[PDB]
Amino acid sequence: SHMWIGVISLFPEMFKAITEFGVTGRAVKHNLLKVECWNPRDFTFDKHKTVDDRPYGGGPGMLMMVQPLRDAIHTAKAAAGEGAKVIYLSPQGRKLDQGGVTELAQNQKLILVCGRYEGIDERLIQTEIDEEWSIGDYVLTGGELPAMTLIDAVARFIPGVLSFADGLLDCPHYTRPEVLEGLTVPPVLMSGHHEEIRKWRLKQSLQRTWLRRPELLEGLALTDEQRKLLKEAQAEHNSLEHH
Amino acid sequence: SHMWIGVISLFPEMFKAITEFGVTGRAVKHNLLKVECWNPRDFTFDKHKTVDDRPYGGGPGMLMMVQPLRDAIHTAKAAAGEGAKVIYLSPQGRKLDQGGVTELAQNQKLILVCGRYEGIDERLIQTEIDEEWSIGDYVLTGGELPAMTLIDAVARFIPGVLSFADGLLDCPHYTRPEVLEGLTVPPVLMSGHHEEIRKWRLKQSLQRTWLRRPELLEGLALTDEQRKLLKEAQAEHNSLEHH
Ligand SMILES: C[S@@+](CC[C@H](N)C(=O)[O-])C[C@H]1O[C@@H](n2cnc3c(N)ncnc32)[C@H](O)[C@@H]1O
Numbered sequence: 281s282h283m284w285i286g287v288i289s290l291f292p293e294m295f296k297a298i299t300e301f302g303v304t305g306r307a308v309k310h311n312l313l314k315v316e317c318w319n320p321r322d323f324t325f326d327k328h329k330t331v332d333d334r335p336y337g338g339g340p341g342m343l344m345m346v347q348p349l350r351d352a353i354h355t356a357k358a359a360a361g362e363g364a365k366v367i368y369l370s371p372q373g374r375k376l377d378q379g380g381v382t383e384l385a386q387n388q389k390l391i392l393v394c395g396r397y398e399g400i401d402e403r404l405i406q407t408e409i410d411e412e413w414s415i416g417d418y419v420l421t422g423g424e425l426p427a428m429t430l431i432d433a434v435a436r437f438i439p440g441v442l443s444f445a446d447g448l449l450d451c452p453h454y455t456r457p458e459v460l461e462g463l464t465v466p467p468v469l470m471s472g473h474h475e476e477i478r479k480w481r482l483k484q485s486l487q488r489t490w491l492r493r494p495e496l497l498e499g500l501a502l503t504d505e506q507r508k509l510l511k512e513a514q515a516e517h518n519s520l521e522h523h
Numbered sequence: 524s525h526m527w528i529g530v531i532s533l534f535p536e537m538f539k540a541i542t543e544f545g546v547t548g549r550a551v552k553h554n555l556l557k558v559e560c561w562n563p564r565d566f567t568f569d570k571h572k573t574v575d576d577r578p579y580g581g582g583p584g585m586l587m588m589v590q591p592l593r594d595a596i597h598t599a600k601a602a603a604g605e606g607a608k609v610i611y612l613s614p615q616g617r618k619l620d621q622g623g624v625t626e627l628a629q630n631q632k633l634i635l636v637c638g639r640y641e642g643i644d645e646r647l648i649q650t651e652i653d654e655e656w657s658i659g660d661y662v663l664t665g666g667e668l669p670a671m672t673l674i675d676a677v678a679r680f681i682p683g684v685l686s687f688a689d690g691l692l693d694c695p696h697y698t699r700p701e702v703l704e705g706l707t708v709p710p711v712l713m714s715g716h717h718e719e720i721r722k723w724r725l726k727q728s729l730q731r732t733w734l735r736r737p738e739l740l741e742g743l744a745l746t747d748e749q750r751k752l753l754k755e756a757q758a759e760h761n762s763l764e765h766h
């Protein structure tokens with residue numbers, strides 16, 4: 281495979297969501313993407329396979345038990361070999377974005393640590409984790425969805441598996457029928473004029489980015505064409521009434 | 524159930540990731556959360572159950588076929604009844620954050636439309652969708668993970684199901700053993716001093732937010748205690764060497 285991803289999770293079966301369906305599922309079956317899981321519960325030794333533990337200092341909630349998680353991590357690292365970057369999914373980590381995705385996609389091996397409960401021991405992060413990554417400024421019940429989100433995002437960059445390409449939102453899309461609930465497809469898209477169609481899409485993208493996410497434009501160095509199309513959109517916007 | 528979520532997806536089985544595991548899985552089994560899916564493929568009429576279609580204007584990629592998707596949406600709305608907010612998961616939508624999560628959690632009924640391929644017809648968004656939401660500035664292969672991310676996030680706010688609570692990153696956590704690879708647990712956490720422990724956690728949160736996500740603090744109105752603890756952390760930071 282072009283990319284191998286080790287996963288530490290109490291719920292390995294959750295990953296079937298990406299390994300068994302759609303383009304990512306195809307990628308896995310075709311060995312372009314390999315996802316291997318290790319479950320901390322399999323590394324417990326007590327009768328009830330305990331995987332959580334009490335946080336020092338008290339407070340509500342529990343934490344992942346260190347020993348089972350630590351052993352699971354070590355086993356994954358042994359299976360990965362040298363060169364594998366170990367990531368902990370966490371809202372305290374670097375916020376994921378397309379730029380970060382392409383950066384992570386450069387790794388041929390990754391080990392993703394998925395926490396549950398209130399998280400994991402800080403010392404494990406310092407001694408076992410290379411990088412902490414967040415998929416957004418919100419809190420989820422576990423690191424599994426965040427891990428799958430990361431895998432799915434990077435997988436798109438793996439040759440053969442298959443917006444923001446120019447740091448812009450995508451343009452609107454249209455398919456059959458020509459008229460839907462009285463709404464028609466923009467005439468230009470049905471003209472067959474490749475060049476005009478190209479410009480329409482770029483202009484729409486610039487317009488939509490300007491109107492919905494103006495901040496995204498600030499950190500962007502526009503080409504002469506982009507500057508022109510944007511100015512046209514803004515001029516057209518300024519010649520209209522608005523709600 | 525306290526919250527009912529309708530889902531339109533070509534891959535209903537992906538949702539087992541949240542309905543069959545962990546706290547969200549418990550919430551579903553206990554009827555606190557209800558997730559019902561409709562698959563556009565079930566609404567096709569041609570021999571091969573086609574669910575994609577060509578985008579007008581050409582260009583690579585396909586789009587969700589309108590008729591099957593539209594019919595799936597209508598059926599969900601009929602099953603939901605009045606009051607259900609229809610959301611389309613899309614990177615062009617409002618970027619999800621804890622504030623948005625709590626806002627969405629106020630809805631007792633939600634219908635989540637999950638796209639595949641290059642997306643869906645813009646006219647469907649205008650005629651069937653109430654709001655567009657994104658889980659982050661990155662591109663995924665489908666709206667299923669984003670939808671599950673949204674469901675998981677909101678589910679945490681449903682009474683009985685169970686960071687950023689104060690707009691701050693969480694503080695470090697520790698559990699057994701007392702010493703891990705030569706690293707000890709901060710003495711204060713094992714002192715039993717509830718008040719000192721409380722202050723340590725708040726201070727750590729402020730410190731971590733300041734160091735990792737300084738922007739998060741700007742849009743925050745600190746309490747006198749928070750201002751004090753932050754100043755202490757910064758003073759302590761300024762009295763040390765740094766790498
Ligand atoms: C309920 S959360 C724990 C939140 C906790 N207050 C903290 O300090 O991490 C459970 C697990 O899901 C992960 N998680 C939750 N939200 C996440 C996000 N936005 N991105 C990545 N991982 C996330 C956590 O890092 C943690 O391992």
Ligand SMILES: C[S@@+](CC[C@H](N)C(=O)[O-])C[C@H]1O[C@@H](n2cnc3c(N)ncnc32)[C@H](O)[C@@H]1O
Binds near residue numbers: 443638665
């Ligand atoms: C490959 S994406 C299509 C990207 C396309 N360029 C666009 O204009 O939407 C396939 C599906 O996943 C959804 N999706 C991808 N990234 C997402 C995100 N960050 N948040 C929410 N939905 C997302 C899309 O909205 C779309 O329905």
